Amino acid sequence: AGWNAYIDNLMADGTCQDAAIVGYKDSPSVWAAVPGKTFVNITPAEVGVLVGKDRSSFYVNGLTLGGQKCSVIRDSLLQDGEFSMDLRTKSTGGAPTFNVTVTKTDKTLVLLMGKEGVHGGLINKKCYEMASHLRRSQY
């Protein structure tokens, strides 16, 4: 599918290190993602935690995206006009951690992970703008 063009668009300005568009209805699957990165390995169990009815068990010790442990910073998944979650990876020692935003549309999750030092607000705005474009195209 021509979904790779959306990944190229998200990765164009050099602020992000990973990006993905994931269908979450029925049997979830990665429609498009940056090859060899983390989001490409997202599982249906991980999608289930992101979109699940329970909005508190992921505060015990976070959640994973492609096996990468993340903490939830803001859960705006059920907030009108946002439908997003902001996360930050969890690593060891002085290893860098990165901001992630997930935005939910009618049929997809748009996921974006920033490079080191890229502010979560920049990633959230970028993810929001792509999700808005997809909603206009009935996705």
Added chain:
Amino acid sequence: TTALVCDNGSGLVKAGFAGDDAPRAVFPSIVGRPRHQGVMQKDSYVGDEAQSKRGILTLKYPIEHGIITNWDDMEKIWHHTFYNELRVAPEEHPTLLTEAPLNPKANREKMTQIMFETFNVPAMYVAIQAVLSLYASGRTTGIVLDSGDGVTHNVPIYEGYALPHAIMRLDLAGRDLTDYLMKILTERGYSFVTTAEREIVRDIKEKLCYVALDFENEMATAASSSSLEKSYELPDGQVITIGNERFRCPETLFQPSFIGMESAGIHETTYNSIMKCDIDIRKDLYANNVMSGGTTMYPGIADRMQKEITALAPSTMKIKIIAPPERKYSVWIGGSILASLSTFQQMWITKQEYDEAGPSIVHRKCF
């Protein structure tokens, strides 16, 4: 072009320029309007000027418990800050404003709209007060206990991001402590009830109060000797002796039942806040407890928090309380740090972004 940093407190406005190590202006957060409200000197007075003319004006606090409640009066405060205190044209400076933890979405949207539409700032950013205090300590992960004049919060923060699900609020802060000290001195036969008497008691509180390491032991010492007594000269020339009131007043932070509140104390809400965070970050929070705000200035408060948190936590947990000497102003100082970094230019909301998205741009960009 220099960015401006404004910390709008329930009690005091702290304002200045990014890159400076202290605010240039610190003034009371009050607006005074004429008592005569008819039709046939000035529409309003702000801060220092408002208090001087207290006899002819009705004074109000536009921020209650850290949240803006009177928007018309808040615009008067911002106008005064820019034009009278800082002497700058707001349209020439990017402006960093602070907000309380858990500030409603409608309030942060209105603050954004007022900055761009009323003051025409070129860019702006809204930061949570406690996060800026953590930056002023040279950290990006930790848990801040911020207690000012109007509200107290425990705010755990991961890499510069406050964790709202774990924030705890205690609706008890410096003003309630002043009112409690007024009540317990009045119980001795003195009379501290008026607005002017409230200011005398606030001065007694700031000068002589402290946090006891062991409250019951300190009460027993106060009842068996005069070793803890201090004298204070009142404006009329009378001398009042402050004894167990010196430590009973801030003890209310640890025991809110003293003022009839059923809330847990600041040590218990610190534990509760840490426990609402991921298991993986809890050791880092316990080792990085930063105190900020005027109500954390009591001598002995860091040693008391160290003892109380040690008693709650697993015995093997490494606990550290950081209480910087400049903590009355660490929110402002942290804002000056953030707004002076080259990474800030990518964080601010520009007028172009505001024109494209409207006030809800503050949800996306500021957290």
Added chain:
Amino acid sequence: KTYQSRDLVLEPIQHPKSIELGMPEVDQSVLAEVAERENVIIGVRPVDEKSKSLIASKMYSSKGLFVKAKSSDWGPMSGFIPVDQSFAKASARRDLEKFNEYAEQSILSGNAVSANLYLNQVRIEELVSKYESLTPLELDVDSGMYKTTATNGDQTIPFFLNKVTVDDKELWQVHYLREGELAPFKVIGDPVSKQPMTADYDLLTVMYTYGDLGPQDKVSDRLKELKDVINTSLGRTDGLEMVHHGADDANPYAVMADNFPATFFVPKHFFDDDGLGEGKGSIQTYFNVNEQGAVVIQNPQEFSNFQQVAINASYRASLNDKWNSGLDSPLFTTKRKLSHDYLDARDEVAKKLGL
């Protein structure tokens, strides 16, 4: 052993020498105790060395506000402000009309009185023998006074000194030839005590702990209260205060003898082994401190280093206080004097934020 914090490097003082100060050491000890009790850093401008005995006598008042007439540096009036400004320093002698008008207006406005000048025996001995400012006194028969002349200023003017008893004290009254006739010499005196004004203790700067900074209930009430504590501690008779409320204009003048050597007084924790930090040493290792606790600041560079050490220790000049402290700026700007805790935190945050 060496002190280091960012770009501030101070090497321990090798072979510390004693520095001559104008302020009597009895008063230096008082100010050292005030700095400790009030937990403030107090800086005082140098006092002219020759006026020390005048101040130590505790008989005179000190220079108040609104007095623009100049003091004298010659004759028996040395250290005082003569009503006739032809007897003042050279700058007044070359602008007589201007300075005589300042002296007369200070008396007409109630800010001063015209007072007789009495000197003690210590002063006569200093002027004749220690400083050789006056020629040896020669007794006259007709007046019963001793004639002398100055060895600097206008050496042709005779002065006449008379032994008098003023309230159980044996003093010398100064007389001169006013329009050719013997008359009592007049100096500017305080309007309450009526006593001649000597140099005062002019505060250079006051640096407070964070707790004492911020808005005030009432141009500063915090400085007014500290000045009252200082005058109370100095214990002079009511009306003979050495420190005055308020401050005169900044003035477009400089001269090193007017700002250095300054005497700073600091809280006693600065003198401990961990005074400047955990293992950074005591303040007296890097700054010249005398036996009375006076921290002696000799030049603008030392002042800048001292100010940085004080700001690093969370002592700052108030926002509400107005000072003209600086002179010969090595780097006396806002950006150059930022606290090292601020700069270190900014560096740490920049690193953590990916910069």
